[PDB]
From a paper:
In the case of GII.27, we obtained X-ray data showing that a single A-trisaccharide molecule bound to the P domain dimer, as previously observed with other GII genotypes. P domain and A-trisaccharide binding interaction was mediated by a network of hydrogen bonds, a hydrophobic interaction, and several water-mediated interactions by both P domain monomers, which was observed with other GII genotypes. The electron density of the bound fucose and A-trisaccharide molecules was clearly discernible and modeled during the final refinement. Overall, NPIH26 norovirus exhibited a divergent fucose binding site from human norovirus and had structural constraints for binding HBGAs, whereas the GII.27 norovirus bound an A-trisaccharide at the common GII HBGA pocket.
Numbering used by the authors:
A (entry chain B): 224 to 533
B (entry chain A): 225 to 533
Write the structure that this text describes.
Amino acid sequence: SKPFTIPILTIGEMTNSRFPVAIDMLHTSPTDNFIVQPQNGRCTLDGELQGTTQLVASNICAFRGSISGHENNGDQHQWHFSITNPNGTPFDPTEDVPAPLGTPDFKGQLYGVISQRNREGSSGNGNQKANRSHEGVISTVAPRFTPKLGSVMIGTWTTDDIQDQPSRFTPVGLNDDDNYKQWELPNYSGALTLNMGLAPSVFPTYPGEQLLFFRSYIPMKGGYGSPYIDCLIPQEWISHFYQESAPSQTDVALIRYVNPDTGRVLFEAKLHRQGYITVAKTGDSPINVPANGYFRFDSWVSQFYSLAPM
Amino acid sequence: KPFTIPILTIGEMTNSRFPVAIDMLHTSPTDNFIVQPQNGRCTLDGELQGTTQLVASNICAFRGSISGHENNGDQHQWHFSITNPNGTPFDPTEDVPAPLGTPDFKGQLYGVISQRNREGSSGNGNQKANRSHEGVISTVAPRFTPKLGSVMIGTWTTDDIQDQPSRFTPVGLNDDDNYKQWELPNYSGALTLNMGLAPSVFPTYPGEQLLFFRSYIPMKGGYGSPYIDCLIPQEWISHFYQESAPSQTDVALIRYVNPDTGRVLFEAKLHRQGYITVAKTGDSPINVPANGYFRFDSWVSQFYSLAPM
Ligand SMILES: CC(=O)N[C@H]1[C@@H](O[C@H]2[C@@H](O)[C@@H](CO)O[C@H](O)[C@@H]2O[C@@H]2O[C@@H](C)[C@@H](O)[C@@H](O)[C@@H]2O)O[C@H](CO)[C@H](O)[C@@H]1O
Ligand SMILES: [Cl-]
Ligand SMILES: [Cl-]
Ligand SMILES: [Cl-]
């Protein structure tokens, strides 16, 4: 009964839901040879968050917790980062969630800054608390990347100035993109273990359709390349659907990308109730649209509605 | 038409003056401050003000390019030419204080500058070299002139910053010794006064104080627990901007409710300019359940006497 709506925000006014950066462009490509199963940026149209998705863009690919020395064999440059929920409470692995909310959902070298503020002991003041921050890398393919079990390993370079203190990791980008695989999930509990509670994979089923992504290019610490990350819907749509909780009348909401000045429709797309978009497009290309453009809801249709080609 | 407030808890919302989740509500007297932040400024009918923009991740961020060292002879300092956040060139002639998202406080903004080289005479996105380094942007430096199109960034490296497209991702403060969250930087440097400012705000009704959404900020080093106070959360700003609901009076009466029990913890005045006041005297925390949130109840006058907090 409650009407379903889409935010009127332009692309440049919205945030990637898999990495805390503005969206750079719309993009489409064939993906039938990938398993497209991101865990951040997952929300049904009636507002059900899935996977590791939470509501604060600034907590995507962030970690909170504390350092407990080095790992059981690693370098003097590798540290045991015990992690909590983004709110400070212990992470409960018995819930069917893949990992603490916001955990990265790709195989790669997550680069950012670890910051510490001491808890302090025999004296007392929030002033007088010592602080330190350093660059660090969290490898999501490391044997000690076990966020579902409550810890990840963080590497720092020549730096040994890391204490057993409350810590937070602010993501910046990738250390390199040698083996960055955005459609390969990490093993959230380590080698040879089962990921549970995952948001499902998504795929176009209707002939001639591809997924439409919201794409952001992301920084690197070093090396060559222009890595990017594709999310299914923007973070601001997730926050909007979560609050509205409008029921989905069919499996597919027909949406039109419109220039609000002219009323011209640039193209149409299918917004699936699972929280992802398909277009009638073949090939690997950006979607050129005016900066003022946005998606508008038109009607509820079926999975068999045939979109105009774009 | 009908005005609404998001049903998010504070831990589900973002500070509109620095890209971090909100930690707590706080109230204190502000008589000895000019409270004129430029980020996190939006009217209830959805008019963005100051340097406010809609992407939380762009708060205290810069995009642009490095053009060598700054005018002096300091090998640690670099000239950061800045653009609009969407990559278009910044126009200094408009009545805006600075590029959107520029920091609105005096302090040492600490973060990471990242570079991805532009295409040359061979070229792929695959052939572009990258580098990132820690850096600090002092908002009181003589060369902090964002309204003139550039800021100075200091780095520990002296030799691995190129004249290339650059972005600054904020992380926190370098230290907090002279961090003043209620003092605006000189967006054009020392020769020129600030322009295009969102107006300053203060309580007026007897016994009222501003209510803030407060977040602690990380530091690169040094001692302290700095925090930053915003007037309304970024997610409220995004909501009001989209709704553009007309403000029926100058004051929305809002009640902070525990949704478990339905009990009202306290009531407050949400002013049409986009800030909150409460009936409380003194520097004080606000003890509320983590699940609570503000609910819009009715439009009242500036003369409405709030129940003491
Ligand atoms: C962590 C650190 O100290 N990095 C240095 C280092 O960076 C190098 C290094 O990581 C090698 C390892 O094979 O790979 C690159 O060369 C990397 O440099 C980075 O990437 C290249 C492509 C350039 O864009 C370079 O500017 C960038 O830093 O050495 C460099 C200088 O050689 C810096 O000293 C880094 O801080
Ligand atoms: Cl490991
Ligand atoms: Cl380029
Ligand atoms: Cl360095």
